[PDB]
C-alpha cells in the first residue's frame, strides 16, 4: 500500500493521479463565471451511483413548485421498503415521514430507502430523466431503483453521467434558474449539510470554500463526489465533479484519490 499511497500523494495533475491508482478518473473543474472547464476524461461515461440523488431531490423540488404542499406530504415507511443502507428511514418503519425530510435524508446520508420512496412520489427514474432533459442535460440518465442502479458495465449507459454533463447540470440546477430561488437554496443547503464526504473532495479543499457535495460509490470499484464550491469571500462559484473507477486499490484509497482531486483543483483555481 505504501508506494500507491505515495504515488497518489505525489500526483500534481489529474492524468498522473489516474495513473497512480491504475484507475479511470473523470474530472470537471468548472468556472461558473466564464464557463471554462479543466479536467480529465470529461465526456466519458461513469456510473452515477448515489450522485444521482442530487437530481432526484431536484425533481421533487421542481414538482413541488407546481404542487404546493407536496413537501409536507407524509409517506409511509414500510418494513418491506427497508434496505441495508437506510440510516434515517430505519427509525421510521411502521410510521411515515415528510417528503422534505426524505429529500434531506437521501442527500445528507445517502439513505437508499428514502431515495426509493421519493422515486415513488415523482414517477420513478423516467421522471428524473425527464427533469434532466427539460433542464438541458441530454447525457445523464436515471433508469433503475436502489440498489440495482449502482451496477455498471462498459457500454451500458443506464444510470450514468459524464463529469462535464453533471458539472453543467449542477450549475443550472443548484446555481441557475431551473428551480425557483427558494427551491434551489433548499437544495444547496442540503448539499452543504452533506455528512458522507469528509474524506473525499472536502478533505483536499481549503477553508476559502464553502462546499456542498454529494458522494456515491459501489462495492466493485466506483467512488464519486460532485461539489459546488462557493468562495466564502464572495465571487463566482466553481463546480467540481469527480468520478473514479479503480478496482486495484482499496475503498479507503479511493477516497484518498478524490481528496487529491480536491488538492489539485484548489491549486488550479489559484
Selected catalytic residue, list 12, 34, 50, 62: 50
Strands (E), 23-105: 24-31, 37-40, 46-47, 74-76, 96-98
Range 168-171 contact pairs with CB under 8 angstroms and sequence separation of 24 or more: 168/30, 168/136, 168/137, 169/55, 169/132, 169/135, 169/136, 169/137, 169/140, 170/54, 170/226, 170/228, 170/239, 170/241, 171/30, 171/32, 171/239
Buried b (16+ CB within 10 A) or exposed e, 139-151: bbbbbebbbebbe
Domain of 199, in residue numbers: 1-270
Q: Is 233 exposed, middle or buried (0-12, 13-18, 19+ CB in 10 A)?
A: exposed
CATH number at residue 223: 3.40.710.10
Q: Which of 124, 92, 125, 87 is nearest to 106 (CA)?
A: 87
Buried b (16+ CB within 10 A) or exposed e, 158-171: bbbbbbbbbbbbbb
Output the nine-digit C-alpha cell for 154. 462498459
DSSP state, 24?
Answer: E
Look up residue 223 and give its three cell numbers.
467512488
Count of alpha carbons within 13 Å of 200, Cβ hemisphere only?
A: 24
Stated resolution in angstroms: 1.8
**Residue keyed to cell 404542487:** 67
Quick one: 193 exposed, middle or buried, by C-beta within 10 A (0-12, 13-18, 19+)? exposed
- In the chain, the number of structural domains is 1
Q: Catalytic annotation on 34?
A: no
Query: Dihedrals φ, ψ of 72, to 5°?
Result: -90, -5
Cell for 35? 464557463
Which residues is 238 bridged to in the sheet? Answer: 31, 229
Phi, psi of 198 (to 5 degrees): -65, -25
Amino acid at each position: 500500500n505504501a508506494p500507491t499511497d505515495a504515488a497518489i500523494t505525489a500526483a500534481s495533475d489529474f492524468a498522473a493521479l489516474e495513473k497512480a491508482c491504475a484507475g479511470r478518473l473523470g474530472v470537471t473543474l468548472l468556472d461558473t463565471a466564464s464557463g471554462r472547464r479543466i479536467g480529465h476524461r470529461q465526456d466519458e461515461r461513469f456510473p452515477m451511483c448515489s450522485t444521482f440523488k442530487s437530481m432526484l431531490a431536484a425533481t421533487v423540488l421542481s414538482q413541488a413548485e407546481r404542487m404546493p404542499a407536496l413537501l409536507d406530504r407524509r409517506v409511509p415507511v414500510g418494513e418491506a421498503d427497508l434496505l441495508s443502507h437506510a440510516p434515517v428511514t430505519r427509525r421510521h418503519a411502521g410510521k411515515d415521514m415528510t417528503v422534505r425530510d426524505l429529500c434531506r435524508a437521501t442527500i445528507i446520508t445517502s439513505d437508499n430507502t428514502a431515495a426509493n420512496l421519493l422515486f415513488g412520489v415523482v414517477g420513478g427514474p423516467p421522471a428524473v430523466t425527464a427533469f434532466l432533459r427539460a433542464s438541458g442535460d441530454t447525457v445523464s440518465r436515471s433508469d433503475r431503483l436502489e440498489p440495482e442502479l449502482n451496477s455498471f458495465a462498459k457500454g451500458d449507459p443506464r444510470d450514468t453521467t459524464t463529469p462535464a454533463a453533471m458539472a453543467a447540470t449542477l450549475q443550472r440546477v443548484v446555481l441557475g434558474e431551473v428551480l425557483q430561488p427558494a427551491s434551489r437554496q433548499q437544495l444547496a443547503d442540503w448539499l452543504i449539510d452533506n455528512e458522507t464526504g469528509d474524506a473525499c473532495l472536502r478533505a483536499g479543499l481549503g477553508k476559502r470554500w464553502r462546499v456542498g457535495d454529494k458522494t456515491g460509490s459501489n462495492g466493485e470499484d466506483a467512488r464519486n463526489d460532485i461539489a459546488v464550491l462557493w468562495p466564502v469571500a464572495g465571487g463566482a462559484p466553481w463546480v467540481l465533479t469527480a468520478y473514479l473507477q479503480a478496482g486495484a486499490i482499496s475503498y479507503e484509497q479511493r477516497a484518498s484519490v478524490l481528496a487529491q482531486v480536491g488538492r489539485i483543483a484548489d491549486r488550479l483555481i489559484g
